[PDB]
Scaffold this active site. Structure first.
Site, short mmCIF file in Angstrom:
data_model
loop_
_atom_site.label_atom_id
_atom_site.label_comp_id
_atom_site.label_asym_id
_atom_site.label_seq_id
_atom_site.Cartn_x
_atom_site.Cartn_y
_atom_site.Cartn_z
N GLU A 122 -16.12 24.93 79.45
CA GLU A 122 -16.86 26.14 79.80
C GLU A 122 -15.94 27.32 80.05
OE1 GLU A 122 -16.74 26.77 83.71
OE2 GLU A 122 -16.64 28.73 82.75
N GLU A 125 -16.23 33.41 81.38
CA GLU A 125 -15.63 34.73 81.37
C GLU A 125 -15.86 35.45 80.04
OE1 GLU A 125 -12.16 31.99 80.14
OE2 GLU A 125 -14.01 31.90 81.35
N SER A 169 -8.80 32.06 82.93
CA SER A 169 -9.89 32.90 82.44
C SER A 169 -9.36 34.29 82.07
CB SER A 169 -10.99 33.01 83.49
OG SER A 169 -10.47 33.44 84.74
N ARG A 170 -8.38 34.78 82.82
CA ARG A 170 -7.80 36.09 82.51
C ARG A 170 -7.02 36.00 81.21
NH1 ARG A 170 -9.99 35.24 87.46
NH2 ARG A 170 -8.01 34.38 88.25
#
Ligand SMILES: NC(=O)c1ccc[n+]([C@@H]2O[C@H](COP(=O)([O-])OP(=O)(O)OC[C@H]3O[C@@H](n4cnc5c(N)ncnc54)[C@H](O)[C@@H]3O)[C@@H](O)[C@H]2O)c1
Ligand SMILES: NC(=O)c1ccc[n+]([C@@H]2O[C@H](COP(=O)([O-])OP(=O)(O)OC[C@H]3O[C@@H](n4cnc5c(N)ncnc54)[C@H](O)[C@@H]3O)[C@@H](O)[C@H]2O)c1
Length: 292
Positions: A122, A125, A169-170
């Site tokens: 998943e 973001e 996520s970044r």
């Protein structure tokens, strides 16, 4: 009468924030046609949560009514859970990061293919309203240089992983927007006395664009995201947030369901896996540069 359900039986593993959200969403009408919540696995003795029963890990792996496992436990336990469920023949949805090891991730993708199961990491973001803004912004532009910094409260590395993994996520935002990146440098500042940490990473795009990625954590620090992208034609230093990303996890579940229905092209599946592994590879390399 005897009726065999065509729905996929789901077990949620780990009932923290993510697990609670998944349990909530599995009850939503958008989950009704294809998914059937069988129960949850927890390391704690809950017995049940509302009408949802707790099932032991052993029973969950053995149960023929369970076709899917949602792995929502802390990062450090993902690898073990994913391996056990894939080996048992269940499809797997796991919250990022799927593992805290590149090699382990490679092994799990191979195992999933072997067992003919769907393995999905998943990445909500990429479904954020803020990301949709960025996708439109970078379209047709050449990145000269940019910076992405995320500040937040302290996070237990032992449970959620090294900052490059916990905050992958970044990195995923950067790779999705600008393509595969090359690692130039990485530094880690740690003041355990003040529960402070700052990770600074310098990356380069295939078009020579230089990106700075910073993850900072410390007591009292508010959750802030700073974006500054300089293009050859225009610039960007602010990303508006006018919504609350409602139902974002259901959006992710929808993608997983498309995979269960085998409605995702081989090309799309391959592109996603390539990106996931590239990001995990970078996180792994960044950790080595900071620790070694
Ligand atoms: N066997 C166990 O110890 C155990 C423990 C937990 C869960 N389960 C689960 O239970 C399900 C099946 O086993 P079960 O005994 O618990 O469920 P069950 O037999 O109690 O389910 C009953 C339903 O099946 C219908 N049905 C069954 N046989 C029928 C027949 N010959 N004619 C007409 N209708 C019939 C009933 O009318 C009813 O709607 C699986 O989903 C399994 O995972 C079994
Ligand atoms: N909670 C979410 O919105 C979310 C989104 C994507 C992935 N995950 C992943 O789910 C697993 C556990 O999540 P959880 O929230 O259910 O457990 P948890 O309930 O034990 O989390 C406690 C606290 O940690 C924070 N947290 C969790 N994962 C974090 C991460 N990667 N970076 C920064 N802060 C984080 C939460 O927001 C919360 O304040 C981890 O693998 C995590 O990376 C959580």
């Amino acid at each position: 009468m005897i009726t065999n359900s065509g729905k996929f039986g789901v077990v949620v593993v780990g009932v923290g924030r993510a697990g609670s959200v998944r349990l909530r969403d599995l009850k939503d009408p958008r989950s009704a046609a294809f998914l059937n919540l069988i129960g949850f696995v927890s390391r704690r003795e809950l017995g049940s949560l509302d009408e949802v029963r707790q099932i032991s890990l052993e029973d969950a792996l053995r149960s023929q009514e369970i076709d899917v496992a949602y792995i929502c436990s802390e990062s450090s336990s993902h690898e073990d859970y994913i391996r056990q469920f894939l080996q048992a023949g269940k499809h797997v949805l796991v919250e990022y990061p799927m593992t805290l090891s590149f090699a382990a991730a490679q092994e799990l993708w191979e195992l999933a293919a072997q067992k003919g199961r769907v393995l999905h990491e998943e990445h909500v973001e990429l479904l954020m309203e803020e990301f949709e803004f960025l996708r439109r912004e970078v379209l047709g532009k050449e990145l000269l240089k940019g910076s992405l910094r995320f500040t937040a409260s302290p996070l237990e590395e032992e449970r959620f992983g090294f900052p490059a993994f916990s905050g992958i996520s970044r990195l995923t935002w950067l790779v999705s927007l600008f393509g595969e990146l090359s690692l130039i440098s990485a530094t880690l500042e740690e003041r355990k006395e003040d529960q402070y940490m700052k990770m600074t990473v310098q990356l380069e795009t295939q078009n020579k664009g230089l990106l700075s990625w910073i993850e900072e954590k410390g007591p009292g620090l508010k959750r802030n995201r700073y974006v500054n992208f300089q293009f050859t034609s225009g610039s960007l230093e602010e990303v508006p947030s006018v919504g609350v990303n409602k139902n974002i996890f259901l959006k992710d579940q929808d993608i997983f369901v498309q995979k269960l229905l085998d409605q995702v092209s081989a090309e799309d599946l391959a592109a996603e896996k390539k990106r996931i592994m590239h990001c995990l590879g970078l996180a792994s390399d960044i950790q080595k540069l900071c620790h070694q």
